[PDB]
């Protein structure tokens with residue numbers, strides 16, 4: 404059996420739930436941590452099912468973990484360690500945000516508290532980021548191809564060619580995004596990704612550049628499903644991902660389905 408499967412068999416209602424099956428505790432990380440600006444670690448409390456993978460969450464330009472705080476309890480309650488981080492300076496570029504995403508992951512593995520390290524599987528790490536943090540999410544996978552999953556949220560980046568990414572990448576675009584429009588950012592990012600890569604592009608209807616900053620069930624249900632399928636190798640969640648989701652909130656979806664288990 405898959406030793407990384409956590410939680411009961413998933414329903415369409417379960418992935419959408421505000422509170423997952425797990426109970427969430429937290430740990431505050433000082434900004435004097437090396438490589439990044441600290442953050443808040445959300446981790447499951449139940450330990451009788453085994454350790455969990457982790458996901459580091461980066462904010463956008465001039466932003467902090469407050470704009471990404473709702474991902475913590477929402478995602479960690481489904482069986483993940485969520486590390487919403489702050490950057491060194493709020494004006495950090497996408498390239499710098501990719502390094503600090505990895506520096507946060509290193510902290511989880513090397514210097515985190517015993518209560519977090521004892522619950523952590525350091526071989527199953529993922530990244531996620533909003534806007535310039537989304538560009539940093541793409542940057543991190545280029546810097547560390549061993550990551551399990553990557554979720555750029557309405558990402559922004561100068562470079563458009565990502566044809567050497569080897570990490571399963573889920574790009575969420577906003578239809579009415581005029582800061583990082585999907586026509587010149589999110590879609591060119593997805594298309595430049597290797598055709599052989601397990602990837603997906605979800606465009607939210609009527610959403611703006613700042614939609615990932617507020618509780619959104621369409622984002623949460625498939626962020627959870629993407630993390631389950633590639634961080635936990637939980638094929639029980641391939642149902643919600645392949646074939647392409649048909650939610651009313653979604654305006655366009657592209658994928659390399661099916662995601663054959665490797």
Ligand SMILES: [Ca+2]
Nearest residue numbers: 434435436439
């Ligand atoms: Ca620091």
